[PDB]
Amino acid sequence: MLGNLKPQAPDKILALMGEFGKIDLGVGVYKDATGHTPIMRAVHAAEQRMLETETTKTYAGLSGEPEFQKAMGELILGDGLKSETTATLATVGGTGALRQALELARMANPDLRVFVSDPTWPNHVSIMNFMGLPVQTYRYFDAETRGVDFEGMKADLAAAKKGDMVLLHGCCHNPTGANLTLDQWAEIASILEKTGALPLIDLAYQGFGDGLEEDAAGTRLIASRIPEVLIAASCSKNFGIYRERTGCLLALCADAATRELAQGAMAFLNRQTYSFPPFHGAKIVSTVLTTPELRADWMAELEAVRSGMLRLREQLAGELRDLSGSDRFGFVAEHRGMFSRLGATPEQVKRIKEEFGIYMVGDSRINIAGLNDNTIPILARAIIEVGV
Amino acid sequence: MLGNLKPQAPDKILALMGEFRADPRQGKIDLGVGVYKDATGHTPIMRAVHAAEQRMLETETTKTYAGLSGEPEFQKAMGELILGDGLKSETTATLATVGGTGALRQALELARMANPDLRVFVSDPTWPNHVSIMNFMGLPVQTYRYFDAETRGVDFEGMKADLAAAKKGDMVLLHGCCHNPTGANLTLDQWAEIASILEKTGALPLIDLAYQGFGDGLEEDAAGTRLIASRIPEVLIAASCSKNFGIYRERTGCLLALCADAATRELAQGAMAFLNRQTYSFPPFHGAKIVSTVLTTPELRADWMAELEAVRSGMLRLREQLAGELRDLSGSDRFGFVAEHRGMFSRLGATPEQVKRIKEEFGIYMVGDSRINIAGLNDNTIPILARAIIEVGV
Ligand SMILES: *Cc1c(COP(=O)(O)O)cnc(C)c1O
Numbered sequence: 001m002l003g004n005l006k007p008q009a010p011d012k013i014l015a016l017m018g019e020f021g022k023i024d025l026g027v028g029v030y031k032d033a034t035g036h037t038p039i040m041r042a043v044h045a046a047e048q049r050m051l052e053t054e055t056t057k058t059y060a061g062l063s064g065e066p067e068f069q070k071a072m073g074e075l076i077l078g079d080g081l082k083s084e085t086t087a088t089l090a091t092v093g094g095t096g097a098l099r100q101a102l103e104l105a106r107m108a109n110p111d112l113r114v115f116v117s118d119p120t121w122p123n124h125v126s127i128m129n130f131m132g133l134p135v136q137t138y139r140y141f142d143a144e145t146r147g148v149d150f151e152g153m154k155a156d157l158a159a160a161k162k163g164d165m166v167l168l169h170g171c172c173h174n175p176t177g178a179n180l181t182l183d184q185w186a187e188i189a190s191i192l193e194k195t196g197a198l199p200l201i202d203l204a205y206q207g208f209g210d211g212l213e214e215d216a217a218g219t220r221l222i223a224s225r226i227p228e229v230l231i232a233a234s235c236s237k238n239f240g241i242y243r244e245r246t247g248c249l250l251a252l253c254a255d256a257a258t259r260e261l262a263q264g265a266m267a268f269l270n271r272q273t274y275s276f277p278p279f280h281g282a283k284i285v286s287t288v289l290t291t292p293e294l295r296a297d298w299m300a301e302l303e304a305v306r307s308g309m310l311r312l313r314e315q316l317a318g319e320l321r322d323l324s325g326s327d328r329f330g331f332v333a334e335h336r337g338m339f340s341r342l343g344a345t346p347e348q349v350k351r352i353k354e355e356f357g358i359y360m361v362g363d364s365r366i367n368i369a370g371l372n373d374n375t376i377p378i379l380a381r382a383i384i385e386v387g388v
Numbered sequence: 389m390l391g392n393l394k395p396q397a398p399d400k401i402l403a404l405m406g407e408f409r410a411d412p413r414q415g416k417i418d419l420g421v422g423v424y425k426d427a428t429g430h431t432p433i434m435r436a437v438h439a440a441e442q443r444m445l446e447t448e449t450t451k452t453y454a455g456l457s458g459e460p461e462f463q464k465a466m467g468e469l470i471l472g473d474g475l476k477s478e479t480t481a482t483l484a485t486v487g488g489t490g491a492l493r494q495a496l497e498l499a500r501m502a503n504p505d506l507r508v509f510v511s512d513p514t515w516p517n518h519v520s521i522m523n524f525m526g527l528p529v530q531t532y533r534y535f536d537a538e539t540r541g542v543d544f545e546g547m548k549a550d551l552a553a554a555k556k557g558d559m560v561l562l563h564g565c566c567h568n569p570t571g572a573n574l575t576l577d578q579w580a581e582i583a584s585i586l587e588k589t590g591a592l593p594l595i596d597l598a599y600q601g602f603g604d605g606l607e608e609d610a611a612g613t614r615l616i617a618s619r620i621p622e623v624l625i626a627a628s629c630s631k632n633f634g635i636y637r638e639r640t641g642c643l644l645a646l647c648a649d650a651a652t653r654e655l656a657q658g659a660m661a662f663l664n665r666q667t668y669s670f671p672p673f674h675g676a677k678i679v680s681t682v683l684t685t686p687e688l689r690a691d692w693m694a695e696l697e698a699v700r701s702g703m704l705r706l707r708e709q710l711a712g713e714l715r716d717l718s719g720s721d722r723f724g725f726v727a728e729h730r731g732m733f734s735r736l737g738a739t740p741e742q743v744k745r746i747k748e749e750f751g752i753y754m755v756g757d758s759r760i761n762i763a764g765l766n767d768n769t770i771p772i773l774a775r776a777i778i779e780v781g782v
């Protein structure tokens with residue numbers, strides 16, 4: 001029977017990971033000056049604290065722990081958190097929350113269509129294809145200016161009927177790195193409430209753009225305006241606990257009645273999939289967020305990560321400028337997040353991986369955290385050498 | 389939109405524990421609990437487990453993304469634990485999952501991918517989650533007799549007849565050991581026979597192995613699984629570490645795909661990793677690493693097996709005690725089955741009325757299907773429970 005199985009398409013971003021003088025600018029993971037993904041101080045402290053306090057590992061909360069649920073809602077929504085109308089579900093990472101979000105939405109409406117950005121995180125369309133959900137794409141990346149094509153984005157979103165779901169990256173847009181301004185978000189909220197489309201926010205990099213609170217500004221704006229909204233959050237990157245698999249889905253409802261419905265359908269979704277969600281990561285997050293001392297060191301470390309990356313983008317931008325006599329590459333200092341689209345065509349892209357030895361996603365997506373004073377110049381010369 | 393959601397039913401556990409707490413009675417007892425509890429009424433962390441976390445706390449340098457299908461050390465270690473020397477790597481595909489329930493879910497998704505017209509056969513009765521997951525997936529479900537309400541043993545003759553109707557490509561779900569909820573198990577000779585019916589029909593066996601080490605022993609409890617694995621070309625094993633390792637909340641388990649050849653192993657393995665990725669990407673690392681650490685570290689492994697054995701011996705003694713107490717009170721060996729049963733659960737075979745009489749009159753709580761948890765018993769509770777069973781006319 002199993003011999004009837006057909007080969008499935010692999011994840012290209014992870015493919016590189018398997019392949020990899022070598023300069024890894026692929027997989028979205030923050031790397032320090034020495035090409036290492038460290039365990040954040042607070043997280044390590046939380047783990048030690050946990051080792052001493054836990055007395056049992058019996059089954060716990062089907063929808064996650066109350067503490068985790070509370071800490072997360074406040075992290076994301078701040079004072080906009082109206083628990084009375086919000087349902088929370090702890091999931092297996094942010095990816096798990098996306099699937100759980102699509103399942104919930106489909107339960108609510110069989111004839112659901114999902115709009116995604118052009119381009120977008122490949123795993124989005126994958127999950128959607130797998131589910132057999134109709135996917136449409138709104139314009140987003142302004143190819144020439146390397147920025148956002150907002151006029152085109154608005155045009156497309158306006159065509160979305162109600163019951164349709166629109167997927168927005170809350171901040172640090174993967175892969176482009178190009179993002180919407182708060183003003184643009186208000187504009188988008190206007191279209192959304194006028195079309196009745198349900199927004200699904202993918203919040204995977206809160207803290208890597210402009211700051212914890214500022215990276216959630218757009219999400220908080222949609223939440224303050226649109227009566228119903230779904231937010232899929234990931235703690236893999238901002239807490240640096242990628243392998244623990246921890247995140248959650250937040251369902252914002254118009255009232256408590258619908259809230260009790262969503263909460264019941266969210267938990268049932270976990271039960272029919274894998275029972276309880278993993279505890280260790282959610283516990284690390286809960287402990288960090290509710291312990292003043294630990295949240296303080298965590299915020300500080302993330303801020304350092306954030307600032308350093310911005311500092312690097314600035315370098316690459318400067319290197320290229322003084323290494324070409326032009327400013328076509330100014331977009332690097334303008335982008336926010338971990339990634340940026342170099343714009344490089346597939347031919348050059350491939351060449352650099354072979355002879356030069358640098359690994360970047362086939363669409364020229366570069367994880368800037370993989371660069372430094374040592375590799376930046378070589379990279380600049382590399383793109384010149386590989387031309388366009 | 390979310391208002392069109394048909395209200396989903398709660399896990400029932402809540403209504404069970406809710407009523408138990410409402411009871412003002414001093415000496416009320418709870419045998420409905422689904423987890424292991426020691427003398428103190430606690431669910432402890434195993435010594436070997438707590439030691440593994442300490443080691444991990446000192447050696448883990450990073451938490452970057454790891455294996456999409458699990459870490460080699462884990463998959464390998466699990467396969468050897470379940471299949472022993474018979475671990476035929478070349479033809480084995482493995483998948484780290486979110487608990488055994490994850491393993492079950494993925495196994496079902498895998499089978500349905502290879503055979504759309506898949507039909508599943510489950511025992512009568514079986515772990516309610518089984519049915520729920522299949523009903524959710526929209527999979528046809530057929531029952532096969534199993535628990536004999538009269539003898540509290542296995543209606544093997546009935547099981548045989550019902551399984552003979554399986555077609556080529558259907559899935560037959562079997563409990564590897566310690567049947568939940570009944571406690572009634574198959575003898576290796578009965579396993580041998582079931583294997584013949586499977587070869588004959590060509591039905592794919594999905595073995596649920598969640599209590600290895602809680603019946604007769606690690607090796608013994610896997611004998612059934614190993615028989616099936618040696619005689620059937622394609623076998624699917626859904627294992628759990630939640631109970632025998634005491635890491636219920638860490639969500640650790642794995643699916644083992646046993647195939648006819650290597651090319652198939654390649655197809656299965658790929659389809660397995662694909663399933664993870666479309667569900668939650670990478671599987672939860674923490675509990676899996678605790679398991680691999682214990683199993684690969686002689687010092688820990690020894691201590692772990694030692695603790696599991698003590699637990700197994702302790703539960704068995706409680707069984708013998710209950711049976712003995714029941715023999716003195718009834719003047720017969722009518723309830724001897726309590727001593728033949730294996731695992732931490734046993735279905736007494738009491739009707740709902742009787743289950744309700746016991747609660748109202750004796751303050752003893754249990755699942756409506758009269759499933760009790762052996763670990764909940766002790767020198768003080770046993771007498772009471774025995775008296776109640778007898779007094780209610782069971
Ligand atoms: C990282 C990431 C996620 C979530 O990853 P998990 O490790 O599953 O938490 C979701 N969306 C995007 C765009 C991401 O980059």
Ligand SMILES: *Cc1c(COP(=O)(O)O)cnc(C)c1O
Nearest residue numbers: 275487488489515568598628630
């Ligand atoms: C415990 C158990 C499982 C696995 O559960 P997880 O908690 O997800 O590890 C599967 N089947 C049965 C019958 C069980 O008792």
Ligand SMILES: O=C(O)CCCc1c[nH]c2ccccc12
Nearest residue numbers: 011013014027028095123174669
């Ligand atoms: O690099 C990125 O795009 C995100 C980080 C890596 C990553 C996390 N989850 C995944 C699922 C599929 C493919 C890649 C991933």
